[PDB]
Amino acid sequence: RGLLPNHIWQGDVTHYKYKKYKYCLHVWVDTFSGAVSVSCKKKETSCETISAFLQAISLLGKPLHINTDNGPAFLSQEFQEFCTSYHIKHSTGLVERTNGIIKNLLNKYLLDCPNLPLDNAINKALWTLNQLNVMSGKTRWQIHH
Amino acid sequence: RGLLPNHIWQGDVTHYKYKKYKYCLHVWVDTFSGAVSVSCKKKETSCETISAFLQAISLLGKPLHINTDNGPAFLSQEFQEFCTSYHIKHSTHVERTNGIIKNLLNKYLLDCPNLPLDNAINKALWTLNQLNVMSGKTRWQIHHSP
Ligand SMILES: [Mg+2]
Ligand SMILES: [Mg+2]
């Protein structure tokens, strides 16, 4: 749907169990390039949501238009304020399968080395999927930048 | 020093006071493009070192060569095993970058006292990599030129 990089992203929160806790992985995916940002948070309040959104912006750049579900955090005024501050249109699966690839990569890296910190695994997965996996022949990173 | 993006990085840890504590900002900067990665950690051990380096790789790409000081973390065996495992050359053969970031932090936290440190760090990165024009290019543009 996005016509170029950073036109439209889709975002969701998905869950992942690590050493007994069920973490919130805040996920952003660019609908043109497929490039992805994931941030491991403990919860899904507006603070964590904005926090993970800012991290995605450092990774991918600032999007024109983001699409989400009707989650409370996305509908909160804190988040609406952020969006307006940043000049981002906000409206209410590419995500489901992107999620799938990330989780299979965390499961693999954790099987190989059980004591791997969750952050390392997430950053290894992000680098693999964005920058290594070829799709035309291009990586998501190439098409993004 | 680096001849194209991701040829040679420099990294260092530097200190930043926020509220009570003295935080470790693990900084990696690409010597060709300028592009920067910064990870806020509570300490400067090999765990924290490796973690911050993986975040940088996810932000920046994998470098061929890294230059660091002689700090404990960098000389440890966990760090050396990470490097060889990733085909990164490491030597012990930045301070201006550290200064530009800390100045953006200070400015951000002066305008809004409650702004979380992590958000300030990510706002800085985005500004410094993708907004500041230098050449007439940003660091990001140079970093991603094929
Ligand atoms: Mg949801
Ligand atoms: Mg030092």
Residue numbers in the entry:
A (entry chain B): 54 to 145, 155 to 197, 200 to 209
B (entry chain A): 54 to 146, 157 to 197, 200 to 211
What did the original publication write about this model?
IN first catalyses 3′-processing of the vDNA ends, exposing reactive 3′ OH nucleophile groups that it uses to attack a pair of phosphodiester bonds within target DNA (tDNA), resulting in strand transfer. In this work, we determine the three-dimensional structure of the deltaretroviral intasome and characterize its interactions with its host factor, the PP2A-B56γ subunit. The deltaretroviral IN host cofactor B56γ14, as part of the heterotrimeric protein phosphatase 2A (PP2A) holoenzyme, interacts with a number of chromatin-associated proteins and potently stimulates concerted integration activity of deltaretroviral INs14.
To aid the interpretation of the cryo-EM map, we generated a high-quality homology model of the STLV-1 IN/NTD using the SWISS-MODEL server, and determined a series of X-ray crystal structures spanning the catalytic core domain (CCD) and the C-terminal domain (CTD) of HTLV-2 and -1 IN.
